[PDB]
């Protein structure tokens, strides 16, 4: 579908081909995060630290509960119906997340039946197992620090020092928490927040949180690094200071008739100057349709591209024509730096700008020369079994394309400038030229 | 001022209206940060750690003092005058910050009268109160770690182990500090650095630092997250290794005749294809003047937009015409992804592309159909009291606009492509077309 032979002559060498995968079909599991530690074993050295901490934390947590109440108070069974008049203004994603929240409230009630047990936990990780329905894990922030550092040093340091250490630890915890759970979180009715971000309520240790789930899969790291494991806040307690979070754990599904092709850019020679083609380096092909892809939001592995949603974007007709073999429509830009790549290797064959770099044949010792009419040279073992480029020596294979590659020649597109200020300069100059041409007709 | 009815027909649904607030009128307060801990209670296990640490820290701190001296040595009372010849080259902001520095120098001298007391502090947070004018808080980095961990374990571990632990803690502190206080700090004569960044000299615990100020306000978190609380370095001591920082604490003032309007994008149907309008989603209106806003630098809350400065930017005449009702000038882009939103809710009324998603009327059970000549459908309770879209069931209100919304029709603008490479491709193609038209006249 792409014309690789013509593209290689303007410095676009064929790279690795990769699969396309997107998350789908998530499982759900609920967990409790308690945001105040249990200080019952050091109660004589607490002062008024806990009261001030509770005031600050309540100030942080109140708006989240307020935002959840908007959907909680206006959703009832019919199979569930939302009151559109009461909601007023909302996106589709927000309404869908509200439906999910209503679904989760059923297990939230069963969990909240364990309030007294939740309040009395004294370890960093605890599994509460009362009945088949009343079972949940509880994770408590800063409990490990208190149990390991402060309790063992009682009466080795003064009570005043212990109190100050506790206060500083709580203040540092709040300083770290505010970025994720502060005013930046104006839309808690959603399921797009990553588990890594949610884990900041537990000091950023998402490994332990995921271990409590008990899952097992070979795509675990790929799921994590593609930001596909998310969570949603379902319930906030303003008297015991804990939250309930539902975690969504999906699988990765491969799109069948799709692939993503990478292109490696190499500088080429034209008119005693060095140039680089301005073409997207990743191209998505789905059912023989060509498009761009916003690959900056995806995860690139050796064998596949993994995304949490479809990131395809449209492409202009001229660019699609350039990719299919019309090289006179492929733009180019001048090279004024020494860091631009000068050669590449594809399927055992070398593509090199031997005007800009020294190319030698190790088999015979003779130099490899490029004429002024050639953009770059293809080197395989029909002409040089072993090539030398600087300090690099490479043994080469055979080219599967045309046997007359180096004697054909290609048509060259127009130059462009890609700097941000230069874009405005070019737009203004073109508009002025258009105005001149327009006023020539009137006169 | 905006033509919401016409805009909704090209998928721009009216969203929340918000207020506009900017910081002003700051109060000032000075504090001391000591960057070397007091090791007098473990002096037998220090080795040569402090000497090496002091050498490294002096290397870090010397350029900052050098940069401050440029303004300190060239400013005198007249009501203060700067020697422009000696300064040489400076922006207006730098000169204003220099004036502020000269103003702070008096309280700096008063604080520096407490040098011996500052050097002898042995706790993480201390309040020195000698006279009404000689009063200041001192915050000492790593003192809590030394007091809580290293001192209590003396002779429980070897002196060599204690020394190594102290050295590693100091090295980690320097590794964290270098990003904020290293060569990236070319211009210390300014008051734009946030308090969060400054708190890195105290381990990143800005909550405690702000608590020492003693202020109280309901907009505290909004001030913090909008990056409106800043600080300026006023004095550096290269023999005791401490700095004096002046903190600026402003209020938020609302611009009276201004508001910011949000637009929610929804895909629409035209010529058997799906499209989205390319229009800014946030619009600033001030005294009935329309402009863009660089909202990425601001804080968006439920009721207002909060910024540390005025981020208004100009808008083209064609875009302003598009927003006021001339929809043939609003550009559009093709949709090739399944993630684009297909419906939205505004003031209890549904705007939905029912060609792309299934729409059903729950009251009667009959389907809701959209013709090929309609971009999207408005759904209120005159036609369907309760609507079903997938797994979503919504009860609806009444539309306050025209009663003939679904039978009028609108004019459609031209398509565009927004990819970065496609921009250069389009510019080059337009220039080539212009050249062809120009040369047609000559011949």
């Amino acid at each position: 579908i792409l014309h690789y032979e013509k593209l290689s002559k303007i410095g676009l060498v064929k790279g690795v081909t990769r699969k396309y995968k997107i998350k789908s079909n998530p499982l759900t599991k609920d967990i409790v995060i308690k945001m105040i530690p249990n200080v019952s074993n050091m109660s004589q050295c607490t002062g008024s630290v806990m009261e001030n901490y509770k005031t600050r934390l309540n100030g942080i947590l109140t708006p989240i509960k307020g935002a959840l109440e908007i959907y909680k108070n206006n959703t009832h069974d019919l199979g569930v119906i939302m009151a559109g008049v009461a909601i007023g203004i909302a996106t589709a994603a927000q309404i869908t997340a509200g439906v999910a929240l209503y679904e989760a409230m059923k297990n939230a009630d069963n969990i909240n039946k364990l309030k007294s047990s939740i309040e009395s936990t004294n370890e960093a990780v605890v599994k509460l197992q009362e009945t088949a329905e009343k079972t949940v894990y509880v994770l408590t922030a800063l409990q490990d620090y208190i149990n390991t550092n402060l309790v063992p040093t009682i009466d080795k340091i003064s009570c005043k020092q212990t109190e100050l250490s506790l206060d500083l630890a709580l203040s540092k915890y709040l300083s770290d928490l505010l970025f994720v759970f502060g005013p930046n979180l104006q839309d808690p009715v959603s399921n797009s927040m990553t588990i890594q971000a949610i884990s900041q309520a537990f000091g950023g240790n998402y490994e332990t949180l995921l271990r409590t789930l008990g899952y097992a899969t070979e795509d675990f790291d790929d799921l994590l690094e593609s930001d596909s494991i998310t969570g949603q806040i379902i319930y906030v307690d303003l008297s015991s200071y804990y939250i309930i979070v539902r975690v969504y754990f999906p699988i990765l599904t491969e799109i069948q008739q799709a692939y993503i092709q990478e292109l490696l850019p190499v500088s080429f020679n034209n008119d005693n100057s060095e140039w680089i083609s301005i073409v997207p380096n990743f191209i998505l092909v789905r059912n023989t349709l060509i498009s761009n892809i916003e690959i900056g939001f995806c995860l690139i592995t050796k064998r596949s591209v993994i995304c949490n949603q479809d990131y395809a974007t449209p492409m202009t007709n001229n660019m699609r024509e350039c990719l299919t073999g019309s090289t006179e429509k492929c733009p180019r830009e001048l090279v004024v730096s020494s860091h631009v790549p000068r050669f590449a290797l594809s399927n055992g064959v070398l593509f090199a700008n031997c005007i800009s770099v020294t190319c030698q044949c190790q088999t015979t010792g003779r130099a490899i020369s490029q004429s002024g009419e050639q953009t770059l040279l293809m080197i395989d073992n029909t002409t040089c079994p072993t090539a030398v480029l600087g300090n690099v020596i490479i043994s080469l294979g055979k080219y599967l394309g045309s046997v007359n590659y180096n004697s054909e020649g290609i048509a060259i597109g127009p130059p462009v400038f890609t700097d941000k200020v230069d874009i405005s300069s070019q737009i203004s100059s073109m508009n002025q030229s258009l105005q001149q041409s327009k006023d020539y007709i009137k006169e | 001022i905006l033509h919401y009815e016409k805009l909704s027909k090209i998928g721009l649904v009216k969203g929340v209206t918000r207020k506009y607030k900017i910081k002003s009128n700051p109060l000032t307060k000075d504090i001391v940060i000591k960057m070397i801990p007091n090791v007098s209670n473990m002096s037998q296990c220090t080795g040569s750690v402090m000497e090496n640490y002091k050498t490294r820290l002096n290397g870090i701190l010397t350029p900052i003092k050098g940069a401050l001296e440029i303004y300190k040595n060239n400013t005198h009372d007249l009501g203060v005058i700067m020697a422009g010849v000696a300064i040489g080259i400076a922006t207006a902001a730098q000169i204003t910050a220099g004036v502020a520095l000269y103003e702070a120098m008096k309280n700096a001298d008063n604080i520096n009268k407490l040098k011996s007391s500052i050097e002898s502090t042995n706790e993480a947070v201390v309040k020195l109160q000698e006279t009404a004018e000689k009063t200041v808080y001192v915050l000492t980095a790593l003192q809590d770690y030394i007091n809580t961990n290293l001192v209590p374990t003396i002779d429980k571990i070897s002196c060599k182990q204690t020394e190594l632990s102290l050295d590693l803690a100091l090295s980690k502190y320097l590794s964290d500090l270098l990003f904020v206080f290293g060569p990236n700090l070319q211009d210390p004569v300014s008051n734009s650095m946030t308090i969060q960044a400054i708190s890195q000299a105290f381990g990143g615990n800005y909550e405690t630092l702000l608590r020492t100020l003693g202020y109280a306000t309901e907009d505290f978190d909004d001030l913090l997250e909008s990056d409106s609380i800043t600080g300026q370095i006023i004095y550096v001591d290269l023999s005791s290794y401490y700095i004096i920082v002046r903190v600026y604490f402003p209020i938020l003032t609302e611009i009276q005749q201004a508001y910011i309007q949000e637009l929610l994008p929804v895909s629409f149907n035209n010529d058997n294809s799906e499209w989205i309008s390319i229009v800014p989603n946030f619009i600033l209106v001030r005294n009935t003047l329309i402009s863009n806003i660089e909202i990425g630098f601001c804080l968006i809350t439920k009721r207002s937009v909060i910024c540390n400065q005025d981020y208004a930017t100009p808008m083209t005449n064609n875009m302003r015409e598009c927003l006021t009702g001339s929809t043939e000038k609003c550009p559009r882009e093709l949709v090739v992804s399944s993630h684009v939103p297909r419906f939205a809710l505004s003031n209890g009324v549904l705007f939905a592309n029912c060609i792309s998603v299934t729409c059903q009327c729950q009251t009667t059970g009959r389907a809701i159909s959209q013709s090929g000549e309609q971009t999207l459908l408005m759904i209120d309770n005159t036609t369907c009291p309760t609507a079903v879209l997938g797994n979503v069931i919504i009860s609806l209100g009444k539309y306050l606009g025209s009663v003939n919304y679904n039978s009028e029709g609108i004019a459609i603008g031209p398509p565009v492509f927004t990819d970065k490479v496609d921009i250069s491709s389009q510019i080059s193609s337009m220039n080539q077309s212009l050249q062809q038209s120009k040369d047609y006249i000559k011949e």
Partner: antibody
Amino acid sequence: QVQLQESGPGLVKPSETLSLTCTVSGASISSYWWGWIRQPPGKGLEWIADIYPNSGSTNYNPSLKSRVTNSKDASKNQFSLKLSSVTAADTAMYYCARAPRGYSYSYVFGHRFDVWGPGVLVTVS
Amino acid sequence: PVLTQPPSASEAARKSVTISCSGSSSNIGSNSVSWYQQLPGTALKLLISYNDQRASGVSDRFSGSKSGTSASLAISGLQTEDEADYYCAAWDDSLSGPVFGGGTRLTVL
């Protein structure tokens, strides 16, 4: 409102042991610090001891440390003090009080007796 | 160990008076001061804590201050109901407890 009541013997013979009891109404003794103070007739106040019943912690005035014992009873919400080998110098008015201490919001450390009992007079004769 | 107060103080009505309290580095230099009032034949009550914070239901005519190893209590708009004894106290790090002053009796003319 928290209220405290002292109780003890009106007259204590020399070289015997003085026993005092403080009864609290409106709060649990196991969630606060408490303290004992005394004032000789016509003189100033003197601190005796502070106690935290929940963990059994105690701080003593160094002059009186060797003659002071403390006890508690959570069922009746009471705490008791005992001073042994009393002389004529131990006649005074005795008070129990609630004694919170700690850092303020602005990191200033302080101690205070915020609620006082009526007090009981003890005469050694 | 002990804090130093003046045994007596006196000032006419509608005037203002100041009572001083002197200590050391272990108690007043590093910690705050509390002030208590004792009226004739009634229970003691807490007037001031944390060097300047008045208790609930305490008139604004009472103020406190601290400088160095010394502290002061100021009474303005002097009235007849202010005749009492006044005591200062401060936490001492070497004792893990409070130390008291000798007390000052206030007489109004």
